[PDB]
């Protein structure tokens, strides 16, 4: 999927992958391309929970996360068009920003890594 690239860092179980409509549990760290963190669920010590593939989150997550298996650690590199685009996200992300997320897939529906 063109606006997002996934780099596997450590494999999950290689069997359970999120599908459109699933609810996933994720720990993440987002950085801008200058290397600076803009947000982290890890530092916040709270897991992030959301439906995937239904537009609840940026396109880059919706298209990137279903490519990971349960337990996988990856990096999702997201073009502005698949992120917050020209506007950015007021108070956090400048307009026209590539987003780089470290993502750990901790849960899919009832299943847990
Ligand atoms: C009631 C409060 C808000 C409510 C916030 C929470 C549940 C708390 C939860 C931990 C979010 C974080 O709170 C510390 C914080 O996460 C960021 O820092 C971040 O790392 C980020 O980019 N994420 C979060 C992880 C998934 C990818 C992306 C996202 O898709 O986030 C989603 C997002 C912003 C979608 C927009 C929606 C508007 C569209 O126009 C735009 O389309 C381009 C896309 C978030 C999760 C929404 O679904 C839910 C919310 O908005 C945002 C920079 C701002 C966000 O706080 C606001």
Residue numbers in the entry: 0 to 112
What wording appears in the published article?
The 12-kDa FK506-binding protein (FKBP12) is a ubiquitously expressed peptidyl-prolyl isomerase with considerable homology between fungal pathogens and is thus a prime candidate for future targeting efforts to generate a panfungal strategy. PPIase proteins all catalyze the cis/trans isomerization of peptide bonds N terminal to proline residues in polypeptide chains. In addition to its role as a PPIase, FKBP12 is a member of the immunophilin family and is the target of the immunosuppressive drugs FK506 and rapamycin. Three extended loops, which have been called the 40s loop (between β2 and β3), the 50s loop (between β3′ and α1), and the 80s loop (between β4 and β5), surround a deep active-site pocket that binds both FK506 and rapamycin.
As for C. albicans FKBP12, we also had difficulty obtaining the structure of the A. fumigatus wild-type (WT) protein in complex with FK506. Thus, we generated the analogous mutation, P90G, and used that protein to obtain the FKBP12(P90G)-FK506 structure. As expected the FK506 molecule is bound in the same active-site pocket of A. fumigatus FKBP12 as in other FKBP12-FK506 complex structures.
